[PDB]
Design a protein around this ligand. Structure first.
Ligand SMILES: Nc1ncnc2c1ncn2[C@@H]1O[C@@H]2COP(=O)(O)O[C@H]2[C@H]1O
Ligand SMILES: Nc1ncnc2c1ncn2[C@@H]1O[C@@H]2COP(=O)(O)O[C@H]2[C@H]1O
Length: 282
């Protein structure tokens, strides 16, 4: 049932279902950037769609009118290449979002989405998405998409996965002399330097210099220890950063690289006669 410029629609939902939608959208950085008021407009504008196992919810190539959030069930996303060689991009489950690209970029569906089980989906129409959400998401991606493709650790990531990093980024600048990370302090944040110069030290010995595209502050996140080193700006630095939960959601596909760079730290620390127990885990 529908309850009564752009005027949002309100589709009748129990508070129990509304709480599930809020959970899913607060997890998604496509959405959790909205104020309380606008957020609730979006929650109310979702309607539902039930789909049998085996149904292609979306076909690679179609025009795009809705995005979807999974309530229950599992959805495989794939591309069909070559000699009908199915190429599975990913498997999506409860709370996952898909179908945003057509609404974001007015483009043919980039892949096929197939229900692997029966699915209950919540659907958001193009109109609600474009009025409420599109502009700010598109501009944040425009601001960072290119920068991120030149960050060396992110270069081995799918472009689709990388645009998601843009969605959850926060921005901050530091002045000459300002301290970004202090040795011994508790921290929960992963950093990329996007402009300027900074320097890392431990027990007042210099252990690394940083320039544009470098990252730091991952060690406290990979190890659950206090910051292992002090990092200081040397000019007008601009950084972007991720919180711990975004870091472990997004930079899973590059754990292996991060851990490898961690053992170069080890060689530096052993050379300078510094503490190497900050590398091991506790
Ligand atoms: N690697 C990927 N490339 C493109 N789309 C993807 C990928 N992984 C998941 N998807 C989702 O699959 C959807 C297919 O339709 P859309 O292109 O509108 O939006 C797409 C994304 O939500
Ligand atoms: N040799 C090194 N050993 C440990 N950390 C280093 C080294 N060189 C640079 N760093 C960085 O300094 C950061 C300080 O905070 P974290 O320990 O979270 O993560 C650390 C690394 O990103």
């Amino acid at each position: 049932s529908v309850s009564a410029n752009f005027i949002p629609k309100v589709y009748k939902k129990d508070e129990k279902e509304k709480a599930k939608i809020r959970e899913a959208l607060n997890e998604s950085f496509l959405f959790n950037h909205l104020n309380k008021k606008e957020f609730e407009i979006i929650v109310n504008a979702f309607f539902d769609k039930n789909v049998e196992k085996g149904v292609n919810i979306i076909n690679e190539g179609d025009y795009g009118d809705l995005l979807y959030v999974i309530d229950q069930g599992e959805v495989e996303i794939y591309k069909t290449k070559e000699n009908n060689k199915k190429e599975v991009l990913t498997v999506l489950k409860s709370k996952d979002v898909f179908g945003e690209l057509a609404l974001l970029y007015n483009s043919k569906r980039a892949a096929t989405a197939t229900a692997l089980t029966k699915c209950h989906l919540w659907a958001l129409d193009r109109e609600s998405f474009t009025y409420i959400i599109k502009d700010m998401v598109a501009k944040k991606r425009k601001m960072y998409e290119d920068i991120l493709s030149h960050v060396n650790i992110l270069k081995d990531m799918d472009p689709y996965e990388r645009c998601k990093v843009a969605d959850c980024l926060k921005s901050k600048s530091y002045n000459d002399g300002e301290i970004i990370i202090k040795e011994g302090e508790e921290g929960d944040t992963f950093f990329i330097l996007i402009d300027g110069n900074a320097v890392a030290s431990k027990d007042n010995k210099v252990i690394k210099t940083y320039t544009k595209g470098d990252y730091f502050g991952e060690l406290a996140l990979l190890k659950n220890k206090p910051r292992a080193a002090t990092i200081k700006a040397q000019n007008f630095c601009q950084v972007v950063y991720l919180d711990r939960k975004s870091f472990k959601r997004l930079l899973g596909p590059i754990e292996d690289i991060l851990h490898r760079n961690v053992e170069n730290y080890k060689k530096v620390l052993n050379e300078l006669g510094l503490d190497t127990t900050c590398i091991d885990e506790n």
